[PDB]
Amino acid sequence: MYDAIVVGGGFSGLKAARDLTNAGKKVLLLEGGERLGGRAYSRESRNVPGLRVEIGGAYLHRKHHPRLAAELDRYGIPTAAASEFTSFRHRLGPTAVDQAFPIPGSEAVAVEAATYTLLRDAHRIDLEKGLENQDLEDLDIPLNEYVDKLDLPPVSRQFLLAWAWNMLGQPADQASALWMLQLVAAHHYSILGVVLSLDEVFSNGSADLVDAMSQEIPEIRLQTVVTGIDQSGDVVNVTVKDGHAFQAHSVIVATPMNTWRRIVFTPALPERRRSVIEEGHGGQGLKILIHVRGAEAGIECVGDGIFPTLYDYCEVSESERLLVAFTDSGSFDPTDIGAVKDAVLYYLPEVEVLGIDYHDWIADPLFEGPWVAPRVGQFSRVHKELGEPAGRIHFVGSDVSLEFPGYIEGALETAECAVNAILHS
Amino acid sequence: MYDAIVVGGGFSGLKAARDLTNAGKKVLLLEGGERLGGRAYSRESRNVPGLRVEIGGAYLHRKHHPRLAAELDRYGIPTAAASEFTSFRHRLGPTAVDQAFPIPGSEAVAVEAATYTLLRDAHRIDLEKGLENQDLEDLDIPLNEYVDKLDLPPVSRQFLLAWAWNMLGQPADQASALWMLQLVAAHHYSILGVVLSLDEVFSNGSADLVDAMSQEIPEIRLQTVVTGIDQSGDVVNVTVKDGHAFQAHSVIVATPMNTWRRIVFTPALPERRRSVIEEGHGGQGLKILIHVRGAEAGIECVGDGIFPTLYDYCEVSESERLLVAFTDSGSFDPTDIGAVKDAVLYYLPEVEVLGIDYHDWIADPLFEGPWVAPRVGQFSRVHKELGEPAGRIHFVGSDVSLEFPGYIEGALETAECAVNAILHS
Numbered sequence: 001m002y003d004a005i006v007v008g009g010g011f012s013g014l015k016a017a018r019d020l021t022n023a024g025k026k027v028l029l030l031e032g033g034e035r036l037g038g039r040a041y042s043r044e045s046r047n048v049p050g051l052r053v054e055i056g057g058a059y060l061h062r063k064h065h066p067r068l069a070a071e072l073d074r075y076g077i078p079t080a081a082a083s084e085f086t087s088f089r090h091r092l093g094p095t096a097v098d099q100a101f102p103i104p105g106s107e108a109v110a111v112e113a114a115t116y117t118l119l120r121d122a123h124r125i126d127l128e129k130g131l132e133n134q135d136l137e138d139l140d141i142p143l144n145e146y147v148d149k150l151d152l153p154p155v156s157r158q159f160l161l162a163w164a165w166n167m168l169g170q171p172a173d174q175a176s177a178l179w180m181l182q183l184v185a186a187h188h189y190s191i192l193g194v195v196l197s198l199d200e201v202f203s204n205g206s207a208d209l210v211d212a213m214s215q216e217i218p219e220i221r222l223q224t225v226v227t228g229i230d231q232s233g234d235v236v237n238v239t240v241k242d243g244h245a246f247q248a249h250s251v252i253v254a255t256p257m258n259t260w261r262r263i264v265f266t267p268a269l270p271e272r273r274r275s276v277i278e279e280g281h282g283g284q285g286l287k288i289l290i291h292v293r294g295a296e297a298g299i300e301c302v303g304d305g306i307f308p309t310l311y312d313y314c315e316v317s318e319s320e321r322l323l324v325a326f327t328d329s330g331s332f333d334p335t336d337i338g339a340v341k342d343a344v345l346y347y348l349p350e351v352e353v354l355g356i357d358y359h360d361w362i363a364d365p366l367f368e369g370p371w372v373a374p375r376v377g378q379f380s381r382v383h384k385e386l387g388e389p390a391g392r393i394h395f396v397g398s399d400v401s402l403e404f405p406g407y408i409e410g411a412l413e414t415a416e417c418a419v420n421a422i423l424h425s
Numbered sequence: 426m427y428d429a430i431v432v433g434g435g436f437s438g439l440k441a442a443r444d445l446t447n448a449g450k451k452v453l454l455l456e457g458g459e460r461l462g463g464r465a466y467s468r469e470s471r472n473v474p475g476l477r478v479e480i481g482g483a484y485l486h487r488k489h490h491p492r493l494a495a496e497l498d499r500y501g502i503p504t505a506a507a508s509e510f511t512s513f514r515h516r517l518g519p520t521a522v523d524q525a526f527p528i529p530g531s532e533a534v535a536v537e538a539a540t541y542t543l544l545r546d547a548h549r550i551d552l553e554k555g556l557e558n559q560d561l562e563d564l565d566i567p568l569n570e571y572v573d574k575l576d577l578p579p580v581s582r583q584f585l586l587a588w589a590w591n592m593l594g595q596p597a598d599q600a601s602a603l604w605m606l607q608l609v610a611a612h613h614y615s616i617l618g619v620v621l622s623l624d625e626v627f628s629n630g631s632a633d634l635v636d637a638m639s640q641e642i643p644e645i646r647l648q649t650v651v652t653g654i655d656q657s658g659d660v661v662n663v664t665v666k667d668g669h670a671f672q673a674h675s676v677i678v679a680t681p682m683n684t685w686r687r688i689v690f691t692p693a694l695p696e697r698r699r700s701v702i703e704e705g706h707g708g709q710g711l712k713i714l715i716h717v718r719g720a721e722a723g724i725e726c727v728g729d730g731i732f733p734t735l736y737d738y739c740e741v742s743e744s745e746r747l748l749v750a751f752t753d754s755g756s757f758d759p760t761d762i763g764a765v766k767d768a769v770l771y772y773l774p775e776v777e778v779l780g781i782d783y784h785d786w787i788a789d790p791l792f793e794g795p796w797v798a799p800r801v802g803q804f805s806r807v808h809k810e811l812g813e814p815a816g817r818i819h820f821v822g823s824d825v826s827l828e829f830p831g832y833i834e835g836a837l838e839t840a841e842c843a844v845n846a847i848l849h850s
């Protein structure tokens with residue numbers, strides 16, 4: 001038997017398992033798949049042989065993300081500034097300006113006012129309490145309705161909705177305004193910070209840190225899918241798809257929220273939690289790497305396209321590049337290459353699409369989702385609860401972070417909490 | 426005897442006297458000087474013969490200033506867009522950008538935050554109540570201290586303080602933060618609107634409207650300085666520097682606040698009012714028209730100069746122009762032409778100063794001040810009261826407007842109030 005079993009080998013699981021190990025505990029980490037790192041997934045390009053790409057999480061900001069910064073410093077892991085953008089090719093209408101902040105002067109007053117309104121709303125949110133414990137229900141409404149109340153003129157209206165489509169992985173009519181405001185809160189109550197936190201990448205890929213962390217973890221089982229967690233006895237029993245059970249005093253669930261519904265918990269999880277767990281969150285984020293010819297370097301495009309954002313990712317050669325597009329998988333089918341060409345040519349009519357690369361996170365049974373975003377009405381019913389212990393079973397992950405949800409920093413933050421909870425026992 | 430005597434023939438007095446006349450009242454207007462229009466003063470340039478200039482109030486915005494808009498439409502008075510600015514020559518340090526909004530991206534987050542803080546503060550202010558009736562005392566502190574609390578980085582810090590020096594006619598250490606916030610409130614709670622309301626000028630000068638209004642006023646006495654207002658009897662008696670007294674049921678004081686202290690009121694004015702009336706406000710605004718050679722058209726400069734602002738005013742010829750500078754008369758001596766040259770050359774080292782033109786509003790015994798600005802601590806003690814009736818004696822003027830203080834619109838607004846008060850009697 002173990003002091004602790006950690007279920008799931010993303011950053012959250014890895015941290016928990018390492019930190020518990022180093023505290024002198026006997027830890028087992030069970031990972032269902034063939035790799036560690038979870039939604040942090042560097043690998044070779046499908047389009048360009050020998051090219052290493054990030055197919056999930058990539059970007060960080062040392063100052064919004066201090067735990068991650070610490071990890072990077074700990075292992076001497078190199079980061080670099082993302083390629084700064086020099087060419088702006090927006091589709092925000094004829095009054096827009098082609099720079100990084102594309103709002104014209106004629107909109108300045110409206111933006112000023114909307115800025116005050118948004119930040120005043122975000123300031124209603126205390127990040128410690130949970131979104132369900134703060135009388136925030138009036139904000140838990142479709143983002144398109146919230147934004148209609150702001151009565152923004154067209155460039156700023158469309159610019160705000162494009163980055164919110166990007167950031168949430170949801171179209172405006174499925175996104176919750178409260179959740180948008182939560183992201184604002186999470187970035188020291190800054191609308192601007194939401195985009196500015198896309199500051200740096202791993203020079204050598206996220207696997208750098210994955211590998212550094214795992215090397216400190218003594219017991220790991222890959223291809224071990226947990227199907228059962230049973231704390232009806234004195235010691236927790238963890239059953240597994242094709243193997244013998246494992247036992248521990250404590251279990252950490254460090255798997256994605258939208259997979260919890262596939263595990264049988266005994267006893268059943270607290271009732272307040274059950275519906276949302278069954279529903280899942282509504283995150284439909286879709287990140288497409290696009291291999292292209294004819295693109296100048298340093299392009300950034302924001303607009304009203306089916307790709308709200310399209311921007312430079314990496315130089316492939318003197319004529320070729322990868323770009324990255326964000327949309328959502330409800331709205332867009334990345335396997336329809338004619339659709340990809342149309343969405344790119346909308347911004348960049350001179351560019352030829354050579355291929356795309358993505359991961360279908362939503363179809364992956366180890367995930368059933370990209371990053372977290374609630375359906376309208378979910379997180380004002382239940383939110384903080386989702387990341388609280390049920391007896392000896394802890395829940396961690398980016399998905400349940402109050403502080404940094406949907407970011408790597410959130411995976412680290414939740415793990416930190418569970419480790420400490422456990423070490424006091 | 427009259428139904429009403431109006432004392433002072435600026436826009437406030439003119440409106441009151443006209444509107445009362447048209448209501449069927451018997452009105453006398455007494456003006457102490459040789460002209461009508463008061464701090465709206467078009468005249469021929471001291472520097473350039475045949476050139477008509479505005480030596481006080483000039484700028485308006487039809488949408489912030491609806492009464493003024495109505496007056497212009499009433500008499501068919503033509504306005505034009507002020508010369509839009511195309512050349513920016515700021516002194517805001519090396520990270521500043523030479524455009525109308527000079528804040529660099531590196532400051533964007535700080536500006537966002539400060540914007541929220543300022544507007545949240547301005548929103549404490551209800552424009553109807555008076556600055557003394559709202560528990561705003563914590564804001565009634567030197568602007569430099571308030572701004573130090575914002576902890577702004579240099580370009581935005583200096584940009585904000587430059588326009589506030591301009592707008593208030595006071596250096597940061599004599600200006601009240603509460604008053605700055607009042608100007609913000611007055612512009613539909615917009616920091617930006619404070620500057621954007623410099624939208625248009627009178628095509629033919631402010632005298633256009635002065636003359637249109639006065640033509641509707643049947644009894645006017647120029648060179649008639651009021652020295653006494655006595656409402657101890659049943660009918661008000663108004664005594665005058667060199668002449669027989671005049672009598673009326675009602676008197677409107679439409680003279681500048683800083684001149685009230687020279688009139689003997691009988692009985693004495695309500696005690697709450699007396700100290701501030703004796704002090705006067707601390708407005709030291711100073712507007713200098715500068716005749717120059719070598720200046721390109723469309724210049725605008727904001728910076729940390731003894732002139733916080735310096736901008737284009739009018740084309741004099743192909744080589745010559747007028748610019749306008751704002752500073753304050755405590756800080757700067759406009760009769761020291763070597764000082765003027767230094768202050769211009771700081772922004773514009775290629776420009777030759779040929780002459781300056783201004784009016785010493787502060788030395789003018791008919792004014793004793795430019796536009797209103799309170800000393801720190803004044804208007805949180807007494808403010809609304811200054812513009813309230815004392816028995817049969819009304820107080821109007823830009824100086825006492827809650828809605829639009831220091832603007833022409835405020836002169837119209839206060840007059841409107843007094844007229845209506847009187848017509849209900």
Ligand SMILES: Cc1cc2nc3c(=O)[nH]c(=O)nc-3n(C[C@H](O)[C@H](O)[C@H](O)COP(=O)(O)OP(=O)(O)OC[C@H]3O[C@@H](n4cnc5c(N)ncnc54)[C@H](O)[C@@H]3O)c2cc1C
Nearest residue numbers: 008010011012032038039056057058059226397398407408
């Ligand atoms: C397209 C995309 C782009 C992103 N971009 C960024 C970004 O730029 N910056 C950033 O900070 N974040 C980014 N992220 C979000 C961030 O990457 C994730 O929220 C974070 O990595 C999640 O870490 P975690 O440990 O909570 O979960 P995961 O990384 O999901 O780890 C969960 C582990 O559980 C395993 N598992 C599932 N079921 C079982 C089972 N029953 N038994 C055993 N194991 C199981 C899975 O294999 C997985 O390894 C992105 C995510 C996606 C999808």
Ligand SMILES: Cc1cc2nc3c(=O)[nH]c(=O)nc-3n(C[C@H](O)[C@H](O)[C@H](O)COP(=O)(O)OP(=O)(O)OC[C@H]3O[C@@H](n4cnc5c(N)ncnc54)[C@H](O)[C@@H]3O)c2cc1C
Nearest residue numbers: 433435436437457463464481482483484651822823832833
């Ligand atoms: C340099 C400067 C620039 C300005 N720029 C602008 C601008 O761009 N836009 C804007 O809207 N406003 C501007 N103004 C502010 C605005 O012009 C004034 O607040 C406004 O015109 C005041 O009108 P009023 O009727 O209250 O008083 P005033 O115009 O001051 O009229 C007061 C009248 O009382 C007379 N008087 C004084 N004592 C007596 C006495 N005892 N008896 C009889 N008469 C007396 C004076 O002669 C005067 O005619 C500016 C002002 C100045 C000084």
Ligand SMILES: CNCCCC(=O)c1ccc(O)nc1
Nearest residue numbers: 082100195196197198199311
């Ligand atoms: C460099 N930090 C964000 C700058 C502003 C911006 O618009 C942006 C968007 C995406 C990205 O990768 N980098 C920058």
Ligand SMILES: CNCCCC(=O)c1ccc(O)nc1
Nearest residue numbers: 507525620621622623624736
């Ligand atoms: C044109 N309206 C204000 C534009 C912005 C500005 O900085 C400004 C300042 C003075 C002035 O006369 N006009 C404009």
Ligand SMILES: CN1CCC[C@@H]1c1ccc(O)nc1
Nearest residue numbers: 059166167198326371406407
């Ligand atoms: C997918 N989200 C989750 C955290 C940050 C990441 C992301 C990365 C790039 C981008 O353009 N938009 C969002």
Ligand SMILES: CN1CCC[C@@H]1c1ccc(O)nc1
Nearest residue numbers: 484591592623751796831832
């Ligand atoms: C003197 N203030 C009083 C109202 C507006 C006026 C003014 C005019 C021009 C300028 O640059 N600053 C202030």
